């Protein structure tokens, strides 16, 4: 069967027809999770250096114009001083959309000192409802989240149904992939929202309606003997 | 001349200016991740193959970055990126450094201003069964045909199973030379009057 031909015939995206132990790891994660922390802040006017200590994982989800069809341009994103808040060995997950971000997101990763080890791709099904960029050749049915490493079980696919128009939320699955890597316990989610606050994570974003972040309270969670825990540890 | 044509050769040494201009170029190079070095890839004479049209460039590992370099160096803007989700015969992802890989990527580049292409007809996700090693799915020919119907197209680093109508396939495991388009046959004779492609 040719699903590309099927899609042309019916409007059913080829991904609609894709079909189809670790709990102890998930529970280890859940035990060692720091309390959720969060801070309203306009990241354009914010000195991210006030965000301490340095992070093991940075999830970056800037509001791109393409998500709506204050937005951030790749010009604005390239200027963030991400390198000043990352630990020497650290990881980044960057939501890049599906257009120029796939190229400008890579420049950003290099700008901040990372190299791309993985290209996680969120494929959106349209089973419940069988629009174009001018430069686009094909219909865009996926978004990319690029993973970067700096310093010294899961797959690279997330498949969910295409959210409602104006729903800009990314699949919560990305958090499971990130946490299953056991990369460290200082996790920063830049441009998170009230709806993304989550244990084990510090959320910084302009729409948060409340803050509880305290730099010294936050660092208390990682002072010795807890300095180097992976997050999958007792 | 509509039927499949091909040239066994080494794409590094063939004088591709004898082949004319193509609405679509597709390529599945042996990136160094029998491979070709980054300068060899950079040096391929892709720019002469098109004035206006599309480049489809399979990439993997660090070639996701390197192929973006070649694609820009050759004169293209990358405007899309096809994802082939690899399934088995029962439509389950086959899987197989930090994450198992369910997919392979194909960069889509534009050069010039191509007109009359049916942009929008297919979507950027292929779901298709894996076959031999490094064998890409035949569905890509359908999407490319629906995008640019009837136009001449060129594949680089194809095997015999890649030969396709309206295409000219180049690779070093093709069974010899098979050219039918008279304009090409002419220029090929002039440039290769003894039939050997060296240096
Ligand atoms: N300078 C050169 N000039 C001209 N041909 C060259 C060449 N340099 C290498 N080629 C040829 O390009 C073709 C590359 N293909 C066919 C790829 C095709 N897209 C397909 O769908 O099948 C391929 O499958 N490559 C492989 N990659 C990794 N593992 C493999 N195991 C067995 N094959 C493997 C080959 O025929 C090669 O001889």
PDB file of N, CA, C and O in Angstrom, chain B residues 51-79:
ATOM      1  N   UNK B  51      18.744  24.806 -13.128  1.00  0.00           N
ATOM      2  CA  UNK B  51      18.487  26.243 -13.010  1.00  0.00           C
ATOM      3  C   UNK B  51      17.334  26.558 -12.068  1.00  0.00           C
ATOM      4  O   UNK B  51      17.424  27.483 -11.263  1.00  0.00           O
ATOM      5  N   UNK B  52      16.228  25.840 -12.186  1.00  0.00           N
ATOM      6  CA  UNK B  52      15.100  26.020 -11.286  1.00  0.00           C
ATOM      7  C   UNK B  52      14.532  24.649 -10.985  1.00  0.00           C
ATOM      8  O   UNK B  52      14.244  23.875 -11.902  1.00  0.00           O
ATOM      9  N   UNK B  53      14.389  24.345  -9.709  1.00  0.00           N
ATOM     10  CA  UNK B  53      13.779  23.096  -9.323  1.00  0.00           C
ATOM     11  C   UNK B  53      14.211  22.732  -7.919  1.00  0.00           C
ATOM     12  O   UNK B  53      14.677  23.583  -7.153  1.00  0.00           O
ATOM     13  N   UNK B  54      14.093  21.444  -7.632  1.00  0.00           N
ATOM     14  CA  UNK B  54      14.200  20.933  -6.284  1.00  0.00           C
ATOM     15  C   UNK B  54      15.305  19.898  -6.185  1.00  0.00           C
ATOM     16  O   UNK B  54      15.582  19.166  -7.133  1.00  0.00           O
ATOM     17  N   UNK B  55      15.942  19.882  -5.023  1.00  0.00           N
ATOM     18  CA  UNK B  55      16.936  18.900  -4.631  1.00  0.00           C
ATOM     19  C   UNK B  55      16.385  18.122  -3.445  1.00  0.00           C
ATOM     20  O   UNK B  55      15.909  18.726  -2.478  1.00  0.00           O
ATOM     21  N   UNK B  56      16.441  16.792  -3.524  1.00  0.00           N
ATOM     22  CA  UNK B  56      16.057  15.901  -2.435  1.00  0.00           C
ATOM     23  C   UNK B  56      17.299  15.155  -1.965  1.00  0.00           C
ATOM     24  O   UNK B  56      17.873  14.375  -2.737  1.00  0.00           O
ATOM     25  N   UNK B  57      17.688  15.358  -0.696  1.00  0.00           N
ATOM     26  CA  UNK B  57      18.996  14.943  -0.170  1.00  0.00           C
ATOM     27  C   UNK B  57      18.855  14.110   1.104  1.00  0.00           C
ATOM     28  O   UNK B  57      18.641  14.651   2.196  1.00  0.00           O
ATOM     29  N   UNK B  58      19.041  12.798   0.977  1.00  0.00           N
ATOM     30  CA  UNK B  58      18.984  11.923   2.140  1.00  0.00           C
ATOM     31  C   UNK B  58      20.164  12.204   3.053  1.00  0.00           C
ATOM     32  O   UNK B  58      21.291  12.394   2.592  1.00  0.00           O
ATOM     33  N   UNK B  59      19.900  12.256   4.360  1.00  0.00           N
ATOM     34  CA  UNK B  59      20.926  12.560   5.351  1.00  0.00           C
ATOM     35  C   UNK B  59      20.686  11.727   6.600  1.00  0.00           C
ATOM     36  O   UNK B  59      19.565  11.301   6.899  1.00  0.00           O
ATOM     37  N   UNK B  60      21.764  11.530   7.346  1.00  0.00           N
ATOM     38  CA  UNK B  60      21.779  10.724   8.554  1.00  0.00           C
ATOM     39  C   UNK B  60      22.954  11.168   9.407  1.00  0.00           C
ATOM     40  O   UNK B  60      23.924  11.734   8.893  1.00  0.00           O
ATOM     41  N   UNK B  61      22.855  10.914  10.711  1.00  0.00           N
ATOM     42  CA  UNK B  61      23.917  11.293  11.629  1.00  0.00           C
ATOM     43  C   UNK B  61      24.387  12.714  11.391  1.00  0.00           C
ATOM     44  O   UNK B  61      23.587  13.637  11.174  1.00  0.00           O
ATOM     45  N   UNK B  62      25.710  12.899  11.387  1.00  0.00           N
ATOM     46  CA  UNK B  62      26.261  14.235  11.202  1.00  0.00           C
ATOM     47  C   UNK B  62      26.042  14.771   9.799  1.00  0.00           C
ATOM     48  O   UNK B  62      26.235  15.979   9.577  1.00  0.00           O
ATOM     49  N   UNK B  63      25.613  13.920   8.856  1.00  0.00           N
ATOM     50  CA  UNK B  63      25.221  14.444   7.553  1.00  0.00           C
ATOM     51  C   UNK B  63      23.977  15.312   7.625  1.00  0.00           C
ATOM     52  O   UNK B  63      23.695  16.023   6.661  1.00  0.00           O
ATOM     53  N   UNK B  64      23.222  15.287   8.725  1.00  0.00           N
ATOM     54  CA  UNK B  64      22.110  16.228   8.832  1.00  0.00           C
ATOM     55  C   UNK B  64      22.622  17.666   8.778  1.00  0.00           C
ATOM     56  O   UNK B  64      22.006  18.534   8.155  1.00  0.00           O
ATOM     57  N   UNK B  65      23.776  17.917   9.397  1.00  0.00           N
ATOM     58  CA  UNK B  65      24.479  19.194   9.310  1.00  0.00           C
ATOM     59  C   UNK B  65      25.279  19.312   8.015  1.00  0.00           C
ATOM     60  O   UNK B  65      25.202  20.329   7.320  1.00  0.00           O
ATOM     61  N   UNK B  66      26.083  18.294   7.696  1.00  0.00           N
ATOM     62  CA  UNK B  66      26.942  18.390   6.522  1.00  0.00           C
ATOM     63  C   UNK B  66      26.128  18.552   5.247  1.00  0.00           C
ATOM     64  O   UNK B  66      26.456  19.385   4.399  1.00  0.00           O
ATOM     65  N   UNK B  67      25.054  17.777   5.098  1.00  0.00           N
ATOM     66  CA  UNK B  67      24.224  17.909   3.917  1.00  0.00           C
ATOM     67  C   UNK B  67      23.544  19.255   3.822  1.00  0.00           C
ATOM     68  O   UNK B  67      23.196  19.700   2.725  1.00  0.00           O
ATOM     69  N   UNK B  68      23.309  19.908   4.964  1.00  0.00           N
ATOM     70  CA  UNK B  68      22.829  21.289   4.922  1.00  0.00           C
ATOM     71  C   UNK B  68      23.898  22.221   4.367  1.00  0.00           C
ATOM     72  O   UNK B  68      23.585  23.204   3.686  1.00  0.00           O
ATOM     73  N   UNK B  69      25.162  21.933   4.664  1.00  0.00           N
ATOM     74  CA  UNK B  69      26.268  22.715   4.122  1.00  0.00           C
ATOM     75  C   UNK B  69      26.363  22.559   2.604  1.00  0.00           C
ATOM     76  O   UNK B  69      26.319  23.548   1.857  1.00  0.00           O
ATOM     77  N   UNK B  70      26.476  21.317   2.128  1.00  0.00           N
ATOM     78  CA  UNK B  70      26.465  21.070   0.687  1.00  0.00           C
ATOM     79  C   UNK B  70      25.243  21.683   0.022  1.00  0.00           C
ATOM     80  O   UNK B  70      25.318  22.237  -1.083  1.00  0.00           O
ATOM     81  N   UNK B  71      24.098  21.570   0.670  1.00  0.00           N
ATOM     82  CA  UNK B  71      22.882  22.049   0.042  1.00  0.00           C
ATOM     83  C   UNK B  71      22.946  23.559  -0.141  1.00  0.00           C
ATOM     84  O   UNK B  71      22.542  24.089  -1.184  1.00  0.00           O
ATOM     85  N   UNK B  72      23.475  24.266   0.862  1.00  0.00           N
ATOM     86  CA  UNK B  72      23.662  25.707   0.732  1.00  0.00           C
ATOM     87  C   UNK B  72      24.832  26.027  -0.197  1.00  0.00           C
ATOM     88  O   UNK B  72      24.712  26.902  -1.067  1.00  0.00           O
ATOM     89  N   UNK B  73      25.959  25.306  -0.055  1.00  0.00           N
ATOM     90  CA  UNK B  73      27.092  25.540  -0.952  1.00  0.00           C
ATOM     91  C   UNK B  73      26.706  25.323  -2.411  1.00  0.00           C
ATOM     92  O   UNK B  73      27.153  26.074  -3.285  1.00  0.00           O
ATOM     93  N   UNK B  74      25.855  24.332  -2.698  1.00  0.00           N
ATOM     94  CA  UNK B  74      25.463  24.094  -4.088  1.00  0.00           C
ATOM     95  C   UNK B  74      24.488  25.133  -4.625  1.00  0.00           C
ATOM     96  O   UNK B  74      24.152  25.077  -5.817  1.00  0.00           O
ATOM     97  N   UNK B  75      24.004  26.048  -3.791  1.00  0.00           N
ATOM     98  CA  UNK B  75      23.103  27.092  -4.229  1.00  0.00           C
ATOM     99  C   UNK B  75      21.638  26.928  -3.871  1.00  0.00           C
ATOM    100  O   UNK B  75      20.796  27.593  -4.482  1.00  0.00           O
ATOM    101  N   UNK B  76      21.306  26.078  -2.912  1.00  0.00           N
ATOM    102  CA  UNK B  76      19.921  25.779  -2.594  1.00  0.00           C
ATOM    103  C   UNK B  76      19.572  26.406  -1.256  1.00  0.00           C
ATOM    104  O   UNK B  76      20.441  26.585  -0.388  1.00  0.00           O
ATOM    105  N   UNK B  77      18.298  26.753  -1.105  1.00  0.00           N
ATOM    106  CA  UNK B  77      17.721  27.034   0.200  1.00  0.00           C
ATOM    107  C   UNK B  77      16.971  25.782   0.641  1.00  0.00           C
ATOM    108  O   UNK B  77      16.236  25.187  -0.159  1.00  0.00           O
ATOM    109  N   UNK B  78      17.171  25.348   1.884  1.00  0.00           N
ATOM    110  CA  UNK B  78      16.398  24.182   2.342  1.00  0.00           C
ATOM    111  C   UNK B  78      15.010  24.642   2.761  1.00  0.00           C
ATOM    112  O   UNK B  78      14.880  25.331   3.778  1.00  0.00           O
ATOM    113  N   UNK B  79      13.977  24.223   2.017  1.00  0.00           N
ATOM    114  CA  UNK B  79      12.595  24.627   2.275  1.00  0.00           C
ATOM    115  C   UNK B  79      11.716  23.525   2.881  1.00  0.00           C
ATOM    116  O   UNK B  79      10.570  23.814   3.268  1.00  0.00           O
TER     117      UNK B  79
END
